Amino acid sequence: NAMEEKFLEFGGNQICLCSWGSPEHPVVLCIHGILEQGLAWQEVALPLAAQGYRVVAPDLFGHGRSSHLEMVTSYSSLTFLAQIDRVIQELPDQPLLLVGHSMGAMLATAIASVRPKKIKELILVELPLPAEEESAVNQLTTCLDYLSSTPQHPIFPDVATAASRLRQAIPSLSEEFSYILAQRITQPNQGGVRWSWDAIIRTRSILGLNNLPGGRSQYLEMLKSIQVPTTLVYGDSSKLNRPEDLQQQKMTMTQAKRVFLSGGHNLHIDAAAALASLILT
Amino acid sequence: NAMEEKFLEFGGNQICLCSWGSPEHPVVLCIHGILEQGLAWQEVALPLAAQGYRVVAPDLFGHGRSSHLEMVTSYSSLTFLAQIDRVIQELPDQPLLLVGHSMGAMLATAIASVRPKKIKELILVELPLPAEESKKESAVNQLTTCLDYLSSTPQHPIFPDVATAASRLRQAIPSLSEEFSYILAQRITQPNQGGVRWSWDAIIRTILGLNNLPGGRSQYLEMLKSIQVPTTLVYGDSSKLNRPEDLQQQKMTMTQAKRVFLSGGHNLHIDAAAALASLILTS
Numbered sequence: 001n002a003m004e005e006k007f008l009e010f011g012g013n014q015i016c017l018c019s020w021g022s023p024e025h026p027v028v029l030c031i032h033g034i035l036e037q038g039l040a041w042q043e044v045a046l047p048l049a050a051q052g053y054r055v056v057a058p059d060l061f062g063h064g065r066s067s068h069l070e071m072v073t074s075y076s077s078l079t080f081l082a083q084i085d086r087v088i089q090e091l092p093d094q095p096l097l098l099v100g101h102s103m104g105a106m107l108a109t110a111i112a113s114v115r116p117k118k119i120k121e122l123i124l125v126e127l128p129l130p131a132e133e134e135s136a137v138n139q140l141t142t143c144l145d146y147l148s149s150t151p152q153h154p155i156f157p158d159v160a161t162a163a164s165r166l167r168q169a170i171p172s173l174s175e176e177f178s179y180i181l182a183q184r185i186t187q188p189n190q191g192g193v194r195w196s197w198d199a200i201i202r203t204r205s206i207l208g209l210n211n212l213p214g215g216r217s218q219y220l221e222m223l224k225s226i227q228v229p230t231t232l233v234y235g236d237s238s239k240l241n242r243p244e245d246l247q248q249q250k251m252t253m254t255q256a257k258r259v260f261l262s263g264g265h266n267l268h269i270d271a272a273a274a275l276a277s278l279i280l281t
Numbered sequence: 282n283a284m285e286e287k288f289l290e291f292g293g294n295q296i297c298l299c300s301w302g303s304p305e306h307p308v309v310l311c312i313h314g315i316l317e318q319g320l321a322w323q324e325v326a327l328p329l330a331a332q333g334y335r336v337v338a339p340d341l342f343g344h345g346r347s348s349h350l351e352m353v354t355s356y357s358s359l360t361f362l363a364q365i366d367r368v369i370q371e372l373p374d375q376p377l378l379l380v381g382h383s384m385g386a387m388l389a390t391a392i393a394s395v396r397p398k399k400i401k402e403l404i405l406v407e408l409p410l411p412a413e414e415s416k417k418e419s420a421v422n423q424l425t426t427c428l429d430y431l432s433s434t435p436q437h438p439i440f441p442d443v444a445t446a447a448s449r450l451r452q453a454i455p456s457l458s459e460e461f462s463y464i465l466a467q468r469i470t471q472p473n474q475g476g477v478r479w480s481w482d483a484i485i486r487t488i489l490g491l492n493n494l495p496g497g498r499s500q501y502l503e504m505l506k507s508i509q510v511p512t513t514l515v516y517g518d519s520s521k522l523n524r525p526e527d528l529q530q531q532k533m534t535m536t537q538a539k540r541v542f543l544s545g546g547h548n549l550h551i552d553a554a555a556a557l558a559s560l561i562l563t564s
Binding site for chain 1: 291292293294350351352353354355357359360362363366367370391394395418420421423424425427428431432490494495496500503504507
C-alpha cells in the first residue's frame with residue numbers, strides 16, 4: 001500500500017522515484033507539474049495500485065527529493081525530458097500508461113511524440129497552451145540577470161505552517177495530505193523550516209520551463225503528431241485555459257478524447273478518484 | 282611570457298582561465314570556437330601581452346582544462362553565455378576588448394548585446410550566420426535524434442601518441458606550426474586504453490543545437506542590429522564560412538560595424554595571428 005522511494009543516478013545527479021503497488025504489475029508513469037513532487041500523485045495512485053497497477057512518479061530535478069542542479073542553466077525542458085527518458089529506460093520494456101499534469105502534461109506530450117512504441121495510452125491533465133510569440137536581447141538580459149540572482153525561501157515556524165500554505169494554494173487538500181506533502185519538501189533552517197525544492201524554479205517562465213526545446217512551433221507540431229491513444233482531461237472550473245485555448249487544443253489534437261472532471265486546475269487533488277477511474281478506463 | 286592558468290568555480294564546475302601578460306594591464310577577453318581551447322589564442326596573445334595588455338581566454342565548459350558537464354543537457358549556448366558573463370564579473374570593472382572566433386564570435390555578440398557598458402570594442406572574427414531554416418515540420422524528428430544522442434556515450438579515438446594527435450590538429454589547420462600543433466595537443470590529450478585520447482568532452486562534437494541560440498536566422502539578425510558597442514567584423518579573404526550573401530547580410534544588419542579582410546581562411550587566429558593582434562591594438 002505505502003509509497004516506496006528509490007534513487008536512480010543520472011548525469012551526476014539523483015532522481016527520486018516514488019512508487020506504489022507490486023513491482024511486477026503494469027506501469028502507470030505519472031509526471032507532476034511545477035513546484036510539486038511525485039508524492040502529489042498519491043490520491044490517484046492508491047486506487048490504481050489497488051487495481052493491479054505499478055504507479056511510478058519521479059520527482060523532477062529541483063523538486064521533491066531529487067537533486068538540485070548546481071548550474072542554473074541546466075534547468076530546461078530538455079533536461080526534464082532527458083530525465084523522464086532515463087526513467088523509462090529503467091522501467092520494464094512493455095508499453096505503459098503515461099499521465100502528466102500541467103507542465104508534466106507538456107513534458108508527457110513531448111515524450112509520447114518521441115517514444116510512441118513505449119506509450120500504450122497518454123493522459124494529459126490540464127495541458128497548457130504555450131506562450132504566443134519583445135526582442136530576444138531584452139529576453140536574454142532578463143534571463144542572465146535572473147540566473148545570477150540567488151533566490152531564497154522564507155523561514156516558516158514549523159511544518160504545519162508549510163502545510164497550511166499548500167492548503168491555501170490547493171483548498172481541496174485534506175489537512176493530513178497537506179502535511180504529508182509539506183513534510184517531504186521542507187528542511188530545518190534558521191530556527192524554523194523552509195521549502196527544500198530549488199528556489200530558482202519559482203520563476204519558471206524566465207527559466208523557459210513553460211516551453212519545449214524547440215519553442216511553440218515544436219509544441220504545436222508535437223500535439224498534432226501524437227500517434228498514441230490520448231485523452232485530454234480538464235477541470236470544469238479551471239482557469240488555466242480560456243475557451244479559445246480549449247478550442248485550439250481540440251482543433252489541433254483532433255483524435256484525442258476530451259473529458260471534463262469536477263475541479264479546478266489541480267485535478268490530481270480535486271478529483272483524484274475520478275481521474276484514477278478515467279485512467280482505469 | 283608563458284601562459285598562466287587560473288581556475289574559477291561556477292555552478293559546481295571549474296572554469297580554466299588562460300592568461301598572458303601582467304594582471305594589472307587592460308584586458309583583452311578572447312572566446313575560442315567549438316572544439317578548441319583558450320591556448321589556441323596564444324599566437325594572437327603574445328604580441329598583445331608584449332604591448333601591455335592582459336589577454337584572458339577562458340576554456341568553454343567541456344573544452345581545454347575546464348570541467349566537463351556531467352549532465353549532457355547542460356551543454357547549451359545559454360550555459361556558455363552564463364559562463365562568459367561569470368568570467369566578466371571576475372575581471373576588473375573597466376570596459377574591455379572582447380574578441381571571439383566562429384562560435385566564440387556568436388557568443389561574443391550575445392554577451393555584448395547583454396552587457397554593452399562592459400565592452401570597449403567588439404571584434405568578431407569569422408562570425409557565422411544561422412542558415413535559413415526549412416518550414417517543413419521536423420521538430421519531432423529533431424528531438425528524437427537529440428534525445429538518442431544525449432543518451433549515447435560517444436568514445437574518442439585512441440591515438441598511439443601525442444604526435445599523432447598533433448598531426449590531426451595540423452591537418453585541420455595547415456598554417457599551424459609543428460611546434461604550436463604539439464603544444465595544443467599536449468594540453469588536450471590524456472592516457473587511455475593503451476594510447477592517448479582527447480581530454481575535451483566527446484559529447485560536444487555534434488544535433489545538440491550548441492552552435493546557436495533559440496530564435497533562428499531572423500531573430501539573430503535582430504540581435505546583431507541591436508549591438509550598440511563599437512564593432513569590427515573580421516573575415517578571412519579565403520574563408521568559405523560566409524557566402525557573398527552572408528557577408529552582405531552582416532554588412533546590411535550591422536551598418537555601423539567596421540569591416541576588415543585579413544589574409545587567410547577561417548582560422549585567422551592561426552593563419553593571420555600577428556595581423557589580428559595588430560587590428561586589436563588599433564581599436
